[PDB]
Design a protein around this ligand. Structure first.
Ligand SMILES: CCCCCC#CCC#CCC#CCC#CCCCC(=O)O
Length: 264
């Protein structure tokens, strides 16, 4: 009935459940300041401070590229936990069957992750380790294949996404819409999910109209970004499969393995 109140509920749930938001990220990115990781020396320095356990194995430590990939996985795993609690604020989600809830999150989490990753990215690098590290885009590109191909497509998406100049009130509803997709494979009650999707997308459309009167096409632009994210995730899963088969040391967190299993 009152779509403005619903938009605010989602926004407040977004601020409460995600450790990073765009406002907090910009404060850090503008200038315990973040340690800058721009080469192997500064990577090893940062690890010894921020993730000492990971490099406390002496000569048995993993290769630098594998340690980085492992840190990315940890971030993903944490964002999954945050996304699962955020989903409860979406009208109708908690009323869905448990199996449908799992399915929606299975296919949505990485689309949501790459969307929200844009908030901690600029053209030179990205915030990591809960805002305490900044790793340069060029360093990540300098890694040996195939690890240098992980983040660059995400930077490419983020640069265009950030040019839309969304704020957290927009992003929170966008992430909600990502989760409420009625065309996910294997859904039980597609009808109820489609109605849930229609409701949240209705809220998103009205919010964008009020919050961005200067950009009349912003809503269709974001619909297209949702399609772009789906393709970005499919391509990411393909890369993860190559790493799994060709990099014996690059262990995949079990929760993420289940997410990728039978996805695409
Ligand atoms: C001392 C800390 C050093 C940080 C090193 C670093 C780094 C780079 C980074 C980072 C943040 C992130 C993320 C989510 C993701 C993803 C896709 C890949 C994983 C997955 O497939 O889940």
């Amino acid at each position: 009935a009152d779509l403005k109140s619903l938009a605010k509920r989602i926004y407040e749930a977004y601020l409460k459940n995600f450790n990073m938001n765009k406002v907090k990220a910009r404060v850090i990115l503008s200038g315990n300041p973040p340690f800058v990781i721009h080469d192997m020396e500064t990577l090893c320095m940062a690890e010894k401070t921020l993730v000492a356990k990971l490099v406390a194995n002496g000569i048995q430590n993993k290769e630098a590229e594998v340690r980085i990939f492992h840190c990315c996985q940890c971030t993903s795993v944490e964002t999954v936990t945050e996304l699962t609690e955020f989903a409860k604020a979406i009208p109708g989600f908690a009323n869905l069957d448990l199996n449908d809830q799992v399915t929606l999150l299975k296919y949505g989490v990485y689309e949501a992750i790459f969307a929200m990753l844009s908030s901690v990215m600029n053209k030179d690098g990205m915030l990591v380790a809960y805002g305490n590290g900044f790793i340069t885009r060029e360093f990540l590109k300098s890694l040996r294949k195939p690890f240098c191909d992980i983040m660059e497509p995400k930077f490419d998406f983020a640069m265009k996404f950030n040019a839309l100049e969304l704020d957290d009130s927009d992003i929170s509803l966008f992430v909600a819409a990502i989760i409420c997709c009625g065309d996910r494979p294997g859904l039980l009650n597609v009808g109820h999910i489609e109605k849930m999707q229609e409701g949240i997308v209705h809220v998103l459309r009205l919010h964008l109209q009020s919050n961005h009167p200067d950009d009349i096409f912003l809503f269709p632009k974001l619909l297209q970004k949702m399609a772009d994210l789906r393709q970005l995730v499919t391509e990411h899963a393909q890369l993860v499969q190559i790493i799994k088969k060709t990099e014996s040391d690059a262990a995949l967190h079990p929760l993420l393995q289940e997410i990728y299993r039978d996805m695409y």
